[PDB]
Ligand binder design. Structure first.
Ligand code: NI
Length: 113
């Protein structure tokens, strides 16, 4: 689809090859692809958030950041947690505040993904 992450950016820390594979896997994730296609979400930039809040959504999906690392050397967060954080950030494309409606949608997107 056009409803993907157009550009991936990782940071200059040890094992940056692994960081990039992390973002590529999230982008190629069947559940993530399905929900972005269904909801017509293009995210121009998916970037790694610096180590040392596990994600941010800037201006309704113009730029999403994900903290992949637990430290500055080789500690990475588990895919399961990062994936849920991405869905969290995507949920922010509709609901900015963590209110009743946010949790409904987040549960819905999680279900579909
Ligand atoms: Ni949030």
């Amino acid at each position: 689809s056009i409803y993907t992450f157009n550009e991936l950016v990782v940071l200059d820390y040890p094992h940056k090859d692994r960081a990039l594979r992390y973002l590529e896997r999230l982008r190629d994730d069947t559940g993530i692809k399905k929900i972005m296609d269904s909801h017509r979400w293009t995210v121009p930039l998916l970037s790694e958030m610096d180590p040392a809040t596990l994600g941010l959504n800037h201006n309704q999906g113009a730029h999403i950041e994900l903290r992949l690392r637990t430290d500055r050397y080789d500690g990475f967060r588990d895919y399961k947690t990062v994936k849920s954080t991405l869905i969290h950030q995507l949920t922010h494309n509709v609901h900015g505040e963590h209110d009743s409606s946010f949790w409904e949608l987040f549960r819905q997107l999680t279900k579909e993904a």
